[PDB]
Design a protein around this ligand. Structure first.
Ligand code: PAR
Ligand code: MG
Ligand code: MG
Ligand code: MG
Ligand code: MG
Ligand code: MG
Ligand code: MG
Ligand code: MG
Ligand code: MG
Ligand code: MG
Ligand code: MG
Ligand code: MG
Ligand code: MG
Ligand code: MG
Ligand code: MG
Ligand code: MG
Ligand code: MG
Ligand code: MG
Ligand code: MG
Ligand code: MG
Ligand code: MG
Ligand code: MG
Ligand code: MG
Ligand code: MG
Ligand code: MG
Ligand code: MG
Ligand code: MG
Ligand code: MG
Ligand code: MG
Ligand code: MG
Ligand code: MG
Ligand code: MG
Ligand code: MG
Ligand code: MG
Ligand code: MG
Ligand code: MG
Ligand code: MG
Ligand code: MG
Ligand code: MG
Ligand code: MG
Ligand code: MG
Ligand code: MG
Ligand code: MG
Ligand code: MG
Ligand code: MG
Ligand code: MG
Ligand code: MG
Ligand code: MG
Ligand code: MG
Ligand code: MG
Ligand code: MG
Ligand code: MG
Ligand code: MG
Ligand code: MG
Ligand code: MG
Ligand code: MG
Ligand code: MG
Ligand code: MG
Ligand code: MG
Ligand code: MG
Ligand code: MG
Ligand code: MG
Ligand code: MG
Ligand code: MG
Ligand code: MG
Ligand code: MG
Ligand code: MG
Ligand code: MG
Ligand code: MG
Ligand code: MG
Ligand code: MG
Ligand code: MG
Ligand code: MG
Ligand code: MG
Ligand code: MG
Ligand code: MG
Ligand code: MG
Ligand code: MG
Ligand code: MG
Ligand code: MG
Ligand code: MG
Ligand code: MG
Ligand code: MG
Ligand code: MG
Ligand code: MG
Ligand code: MG
Ligand code: MG
Ligand code: MG
Ligand code: MG
Ligand code: MG
Ligand code: MG
Ligand code: MG
Ligand code: MG
Ligand code: MG
Ligand code: MG
Ligand code: MG
Ligand code: MG
Ligand code: MG
Ligand code: MG
Ligand code: MG
Ligand code: MG
Ligand code: MG
Ligand code: MG
Ligand code: MG
Ligand code: MG
Ligand code: MG
Ligand code: MG
Ligand code: MG
Ligand code: MG
Ligand code: MG
Ligand code: MG
Ligand code: MG
Ligand code: MG
Ligand code: MG
Ligand code: MG
Ligand code: MG
Ligand code: MG
Ligand code: MG
Ligand code: MG
Ligand code: MG
Ligand code: MG
Ligand code: MG
Ligand code: MG
Ligand code: MG
Ligand code: MG
Ligand code: MG
Ligand code: MG
Ligand code: MG
Ligand code: MG
Ligand code: MG
Ligand code: MG
Ligand code: MG
Ligand code: MG
Ligand code: MG
Lengths: 49, 272
RNA sequence: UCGAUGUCGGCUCGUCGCAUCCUGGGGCUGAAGAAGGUCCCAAGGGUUGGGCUGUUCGCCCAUUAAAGCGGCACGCGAGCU
RNA sequence: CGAAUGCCGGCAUGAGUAACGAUAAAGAGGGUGAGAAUCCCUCUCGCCGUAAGCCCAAGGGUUCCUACGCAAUGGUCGUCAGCGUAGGGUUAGGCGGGACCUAAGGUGAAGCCGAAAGGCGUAGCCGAAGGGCAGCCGGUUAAUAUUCCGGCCCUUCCCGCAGGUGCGAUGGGGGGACGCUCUAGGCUAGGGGGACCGGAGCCAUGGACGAGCCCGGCCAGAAGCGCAGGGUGGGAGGUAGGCAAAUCCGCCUCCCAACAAGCUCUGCGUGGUGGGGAAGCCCGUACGGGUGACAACCCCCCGAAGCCAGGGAGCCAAGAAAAGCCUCUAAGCACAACCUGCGGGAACCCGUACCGCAAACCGACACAGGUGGGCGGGUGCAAGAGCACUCAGGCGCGCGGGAGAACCCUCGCCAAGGAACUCUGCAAGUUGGCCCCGUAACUUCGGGAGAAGGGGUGCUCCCUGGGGUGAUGAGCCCCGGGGAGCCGCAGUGAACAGGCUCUGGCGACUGUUUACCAAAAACACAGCUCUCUGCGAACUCGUAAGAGGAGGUAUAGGGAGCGACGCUUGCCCGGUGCCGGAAGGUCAAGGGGAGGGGUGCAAGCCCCGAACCGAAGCCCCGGUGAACGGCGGCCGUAACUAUAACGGUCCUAAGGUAGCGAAAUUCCUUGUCGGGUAAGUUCCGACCUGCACGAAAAGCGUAACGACCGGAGCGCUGUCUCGGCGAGGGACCCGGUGAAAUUGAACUGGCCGUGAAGAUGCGGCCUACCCGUGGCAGGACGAAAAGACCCCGUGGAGCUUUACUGCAGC
RNA sequence: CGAGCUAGCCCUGGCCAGGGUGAAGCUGGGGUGAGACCCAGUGGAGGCCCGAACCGGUGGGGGAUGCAAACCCCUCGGAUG
RNA sequence: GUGGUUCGUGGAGCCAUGGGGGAAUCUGGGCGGACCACCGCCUAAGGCUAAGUACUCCGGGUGACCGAUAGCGCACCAGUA
RNA sequence: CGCGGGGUGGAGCAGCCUGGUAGCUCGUCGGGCUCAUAACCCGAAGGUCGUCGGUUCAAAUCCGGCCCCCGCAACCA
RNA sequence: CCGAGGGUAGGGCCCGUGACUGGGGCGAAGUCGUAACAAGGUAGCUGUACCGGAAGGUGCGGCUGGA
RNA sequence: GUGGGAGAGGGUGGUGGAAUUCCCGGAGUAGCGGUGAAAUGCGCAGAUACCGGGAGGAACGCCGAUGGCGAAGGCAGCCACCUGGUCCACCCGUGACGCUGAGGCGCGAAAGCGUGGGGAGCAAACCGGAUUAGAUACCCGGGUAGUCCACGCCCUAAACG
């Protein structure tokens, strides 16, 4: 059947990107938490040009 | 007149379509004056706030003239009468000698080629606009302003009118389509005649689809729902209500008057 | 037995009891004969197909030597429905 | 630490067991190699071919090509690979995206709001498979190519010269600019045929040296032509409108056109030139190379859904925007600037490999699943993207070899009977395409209809009628008619392709739904009615601003119910709701202070506090049922009995009307009559004693409709009497890889007892050598889920109301 | 933190082979005082019909440590809304 | 009308304040728990002010703290696979 | 089986809960009006309060047990 | 080829019969009430419409076969 | 043909006054309505009667007759338009062109029906209050369809002279 993962680079970027997270206090805290944690990747790596 | 069909299909046996014979050879509209992009959307910034809206034909807005006092004294020739997707009535395309082209909402009896004009001057004829004062008591009228210089707001639906009843210092009394008795300021413009397309009420949609074409989504009964959804939801195999009939939001829907009492508008109203 | 013993009926497959439906043997009969009645002995084999109902059971239809009664977790769902 | 269905790890059992992932299928010869069913090569065979073939887009991210490798990854093997190591590979002014434009939506200077965080927000900005915009055909790499190279052709900028003109904006106008169905004319893509042109070759096995077989007979292409077609009126006055101004546009008014005549604009033919160019044969490949070749490259026919394109006609549901572009003027500037021609120079950034219906994407897997767009040949069957075969092209699905038991799956056939099967004709059969006869009740006049029931269907010859393309003909292609005759069991000879009827219930109808057990009689639906709402509407969302409603205005918007249509929808306003009542009773803060209290020597200061004045709400007075709802009891009576039109009496707010009724409602119940049957708890018709119908939670009907549900009959059958045989995939045996839930340990029989009441384990007796393999399922109260029923816990949640108490809202 | 699954709406695009049935309206004839209306022929409507693609998910069988945490087979609904 | 304090409306002051009313400048004003008298204590409606106090990302010292299932999640290129 | 409501002149009903008094409508009987019947008018009659118990000074009335009558309930399996 | 007839399927008309139902006629002395004929005690009749055990009543228009 | 005449003959558009009902303002009180008699009902929340204003529908008093007009049904305030029939005079034109009329076709009171509008008065059904043995009637107080208009049906009558 159709499963739940339907990859889209634009969506992944607009949805979970560094700039989206930065836009709101909710998201800014996510970066803070991930930084303090020592996460190698703050936001998902969306590729291609 | 109303177009009628033979039952060559079920739902074609009741279906019924407007007569478009008053639609003069001018079916597609007029750029310049109108159209605008019209912005379909069944809801506010976010959430739906009027249920069951959506779908249905794309539209172009015809930006019509609801304040006729710009062109006081300037007459215009009625050039055409065309279909307007965004109202029950039809619209008149008129050419002002000025050059300017406006649409007026098209009254019953309006003929193409006719002369029409607005102002204190203005022969009392079908199509003309006047401040309510100079209009003879008892004449039927439409596109009436509520307060002066604020635009036509009463009687624009197809086949509607108001009748002038009497006067009272600065106000003339109106009898509105609903039957209400209203004091409306003398200085309010209103155009003589009834609205026309009066056979609009006689049309039978005929099937579900037609409803959808006009963007009317299926309306579901409270009875059909559940207690979470509606006061009428549940219980077992059908149910008669079990309380005084209500809206989904709990207010009673048979009888409960809802106009706020202390409206300052009150001292200008005399009926139902 | 509730940290589960699947629960009616049917179908398939049986097997057992006898307080026997038939067939065998028998006494009494209000047993002339034929046919019955009723009691004792006896389970070795047999104990039909259909209409109706989920039905068990029953009521019908047409037959029959007869169209027996019960138990086996109201036998039988790691066998089926 | 011995237990916690404990936690982590390790190793057993089940076990050499089940499986090895579509039943599209393999066989052989030769290579290579330490080692081949599994890798390369050749021959034969099979499968796909509206794909299982080609090309995009997304997603993936080196998987591309090559050399060397086989520990692991591959359900076996592997010399192989999408795997390991290394090296190489992605080339653009013209393709896509960006230095262009706007859509929803986002953001958001002005502004508005919000305890904070933040929420809104006309301008602008961002935002795209939509608008705009200039490259076609061939050749080269092991791997890129509309990117490199060849030929042919274009686009912007910048600077020159030469000729034109009042040039000139983010401002004005125009255009861009638009639906759905159906479509004409002419083209092109693509396809068929050819006695004609071009080709290596080939006469087999009885015949054929033949207008024989086989293979192929094209592509691109500036200007100029030609053919189709699309857009467009030209003057001159006047002007008060297009938010400044215009010569532009708009609106008047006169002339000439009304035609596409003329201007332009596309498409298609043709075109200077450029390029491609089979079968076969020969070569060595993992494949391509050569020859065929000076290859030929011509004539008919079919022909789009694509092109001309903004074509035409019809309809109602009435069908983006902005820039580019044309034009008009404003400031400015007119030695500027802008337009046309020609030259020279300038022309950035990112993508480009490969996969791409799939072993490279989404599903933990080389997973029978899911994945948007374009091309998608031929023949036949009425047509088609259907079906059978088959070009090109791609595959035989990464375990095999035997065997020929039970049983399972999928499939084929069956004497006689044919629903006797069963909850049920569940399943399976019958029927099936096309042409022609022919069709009932009923009906809303459309239908019911494919009703039903029939007949025809191949091939050959003779005669003959219409078109189409050609010229008014031959051909080539479409549709017809008539007449003889031939063969077989059978002519839509294969594949694809309704079983029919009668009668009930429900729902009018097409639709919709519980993604993953319910598709329905449930939801929706046109339509009917009630009620709210005069517009800063009612209502909804939000603390607010604000927004939806709606750029709508009572023929409109919201809410409720009923639910096509027909005929209709009775009585009750006592209680509850809602509606209406400037009277009265009650009624809070507040006003008011008769009167009283506490302290002070006092002036004072501080307390309580009755009259009376005080809203809404409640009370009370009315209305209102397509508002919440409700719509009786007991006795008696007629000249046979029986029954009761008729009467009495009690109570109510009134005491269910019409229509229907053993019902999707009937307990007693398989009611009682009638019908279908040999037989009928079901079904249909009636009766009415309606436990417990009944009128918009509508009542009673209704043609048509339905993967609904009931009853019947015909037809047909392996459903059954009652089975039998055959087929293939498994099951079985051999080689290779090799799981699982479960498991206190086990050296694990029957009976009658007994035991916490159902014993392999206890007693007595009976039976019984040790160990496996295929099978069957009675038992181990077998496995699986800390029972989902039941109860319990002063456990929890969703729901409700005239439960309590609050809050929003009013 | 999620509408990259699912539900609705918004904006912009795409798709729907081939066959049937034959409404209105046109045109001619008929009819009448003029009409209605009736015959043709033309026309090409429709939540119209058969049937692929496509969207479904009706009944039965299989599957049930599956090919698959919803699949496969035969059958079946819709297919210009 | 509320919050603060031990103070939950209590005899409920004190301290803050959303609403309404609304003064005075030393013979002015607040407080000492309703209030009044007395006796006293303070000088509101402007602001700043080290130190003593809190913590431990980081450096160091020490342990009747651990010793790879322990000790931090990580002794090991771990907020990684 | 369980529950709660009821039996009162000839008929249908009041009378009880706060025990002492059985009332209404009809019907029945006698008398009138009328030619006659009904209607109407004037008089009058009629009840072991279902039965067995006791409670009290006194029971239709209050409390127990049977007797018919009506009404409801009988759910989860 | 035709063709008696037989067979299959579907229609038309007619006759018989059917639980049950509808109204009708007829049958000396059963029940209810009084609608009509006198002005019938509400003038009657009437087409229609609704209602009622029943005759009937009422609405609307009409008639004289009444005043 | 020519020239005249009377008429509620038909259709459309417009208009006038009286009266009833409801609303508003004033003034005004204790009863009004109704009947055989009553009651229901309305009224101190201010009824009835009286004056002022406004709204809305329907029917047109006097003239009016025992009258006129039409084929009947039927037609009545007034005005204008459109329009049918018809009588007289003159004897001017045609020249037998006539009468009737199965069928057909049109028209056709009232009630009724569909769709929409309208709704003052009246009023089937219905609710009450009296009458009666009873009253599903007659009288009385309410009251909805309908009565009014547009368009489409229906086709009946004591459609009677
Ligand atoms: N022939 C009379 C027709 O039927 C009806 O009349 C019928 C009934 O009304 C009538 O019934 C009458 C009754 O009215 C009257 N008041 C009492 C009488 N005893 C009855 O009588 C009936 O029954 C008896 C006995 O059985 C018979 O002998 C007698 O013939 C018969 N008429 O009996 C008639 C049938 O015989 C219509 N009313 C009348 O208009 C119609 O024309
Ligand atoms: Mg525009
Ligand atoms: Mg919002
Ligand atoms: Mg937002
Ligand atoms: Mg609904
Ligand atoms: Mg529900
Ligand atoms: Mg609720
Ligand atoms: Mg129910
Ligand atoms: Mg409910
Ligand atoms: Mg248990
Ligand atoms: Mg256990
Ligand atoms: Mg178990
Ligand atoms: Mg014995
Ligand atoms: Mg004997
Ligand atoms: Mg049968
Ligand atoms: Mg037995
Ligand atoms: Mg038992
Ligand atoms: Mg049993
Ligand atoms: Mg059992
Ligand atoms: Mg089972
Ligand atoms: Mg078991
Ligand atoms: Mg222990
Ligand atoms: Mg373990
Ligand atoms: Mg085993
Ligand atoms: Mg095995
Ligand atoms: Mg195996
Ligand atoms: Mg395989
Ligand atoms: Mg094949
Ligand atoms: Mg790699
Ligand atoms: Mg490779
Ligand atoms: Mg290699
Ligand atoms: Mg391997
Ligand atoms: Mg594998
Ligand atoms: Mg090797
Ligand atoms: Mg590699
Ligand atoms: Mg740059
Ligand atoms: Mg940009
Ligand atoms: Mg932009
Ligand atoms: Mg914002
Ligand atoms: Mg915006
Ligand atoms: Mg773009
Ligand atoms: Mg481009
Ligand atoms: Mg390549
Ligand atoms: Mg210029
Ligand atoms: Mg411009
Ligand atoms: Mg522009
Ligand atoms: Mg030979
Ligand atoms: Mg060319
Ligand atoms: Mg200007
Ligand atoms: Mg070549
Ligand atoms: Mg066009
Ligand atoms: Mg712009
Ligand atoms: Mg590339
Ligand atoms: Mg590529
Ligand atoms: Mg594809
Ligand atoms: Mg594989
Ligand atoms: Mg796959
Ligand atoms: Mg697809
Ligand atoms: Mg094709
Ligand atoms: Mg075909
Ligand atoms: Mg195919
Ligand atoms: Mg057979
Ligand atoms: Mg046979
Ligand atoms: Mg048969
Ligand atoms: Mg049977
Ligand atoms: Mg049987
Ligand atoms: Mg059946
Ligand atoms: Mg079947
Ligand atoms: Mg049926
Ligand atoms: Mg049916
Ligand atoms: Mg349905
Ligand atoms: Mg679905
Ligand atoms: Mg489901
Ligand atoms: Mg379905
Ligand atoms: Mg299903
Ligand atoms: Mg708004
Ligand atoms: Mg709006
Ligand atoms: Mg509404
Ligand atoms: Mg319904
Ligand atoms: Mg419903
Ligand atoms: Mg009702
Ligand atoms: Mg009530
Ligand atoms: Mg009331
Ligand atoms: Mg009430
Ligand atoms: Mg009130
Ligand atoms: Mg009050
Ligand atoms: Mg019955
Ligand atoms: Mg019932
Ligand atoms: Mg029978
Ligand atoms: Mg029977
Ligand atoms: Mg019901
Ligand atoms: Mg109802
Ligand atoms: Mg219904
Ligand atoms: Mg359907
Ligand atoms: Mg079989
Ligand atoms: Mg086999
Ligand atoms: Mg093996
Ligand atoms: Mg266990
Ligand atoms: Mg035992
Ligand atoms: Mg032992
Ligand atoms: Mg033992
Ligand atoms: Mg077993
Ligand atoms: Mg438990
Ligand atoms: Mg408790
Ligand atoms: Mg036609
Ligand atoms: Mg069609
Ligand atoms: Mg369709
Ligand atoms: Mg179809
Ligand atoms: Mg406190
Ligand atoms: Mg103080
Ligand atoms: Mg102090
Ligand atoms: Mg102090
Ligand atoms: Mg400080
Ligand atoms: Mg230690
Ligand atoms: Mg550790
Ligand atoms: Mg260690
Ligand atoms: Mg750890
Ligand atoms: Mg239960
Ligand atoms: Mg008969
Ligand atoms: Mg009879
Ligand atoms: Mg009478
Ligand atoms: Mg009489
Ligand atoms: Mg009379
Ligand atoms: Mg009458
Ligand atoms: Mg009556
Ligand atoms: Mg003469
Ligand atoms: Mg005549
Ligand atoms: Mg009539
Ligand atoms: Mg009438
Ligand atoms: Mg209607
Ligand atoms: Mg009245
Ligand atoms: Mg009356
Ligand atoms: Mg009387
Ligand atoms: Mg007469």
């Amino acid at each position: 059947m159709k499963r739940t993962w339907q990859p889209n680079r634009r969506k992944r970027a607009k949805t979970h990107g560094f700039r989206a997270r930065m836009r709101t206090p909710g998201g800014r805290k996510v970066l803070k938490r991930r930084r303090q944690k020592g996460r190698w990747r703050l936001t998902p790596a969306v590729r291609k040009r | 007149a109303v177009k009628k069909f033979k039952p060559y299909t079920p739902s074609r046996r009741f279906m019924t379509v407007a007569d478009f014979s008053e639609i003069t050879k001018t079916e597609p509209e007029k750029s310049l004056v109108k159209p605008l992009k019209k912005t379909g959307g069944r809801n506010n910034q976010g959430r739906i706030t009027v249920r069951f809206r959506g779908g249905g034909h794309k539209r172009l807005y015809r930006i019509i003239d609801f304040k006729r006092w710009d062109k006081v004294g300037i007459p215009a020739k009625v050039a055409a009468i065309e279909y307007d997707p965004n109202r029950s009535a039809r619209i008149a395309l008129l050419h002002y000698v000025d050059g300017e082209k406006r649409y007026i909402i098209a009254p019953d009896g309006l003929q193409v080629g006719q002369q029409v004009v607005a102002g204190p001057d203005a022969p009392i004829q079908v199509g003309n606009a006047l401040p309510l004062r100079f209009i003879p008591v008892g004449t039927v009228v439409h596109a009436v302003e509520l307060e002066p210089k604020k635009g036509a707001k009463l009687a624009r639906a197809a086949g509607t009118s108001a009748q002038i009843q009497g006067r009272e210092g600065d106000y003339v009394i109106l009898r509105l389509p609903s039957g209400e008795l209203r004091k409306v300021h003398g200085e309010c413009y209103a155009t003589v005649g009834a609205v026309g397309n009066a056979d609009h009420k006689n049309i039978v949609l005929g099937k579900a689809g037609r409803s959808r074409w006009l963007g009317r989504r299926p309306h579901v009964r409270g009875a059909a729902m559940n207690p979470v959804d509606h006061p009428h939801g549940g219980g077992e195999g059908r149910a008669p209500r079990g309380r005084p009939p209500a809206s989904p939001w709990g207010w009673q829907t048979k009888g409960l008057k809802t106009r706020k009492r202390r409206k300052p508008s009150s001292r200008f109203i005399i009926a139902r």
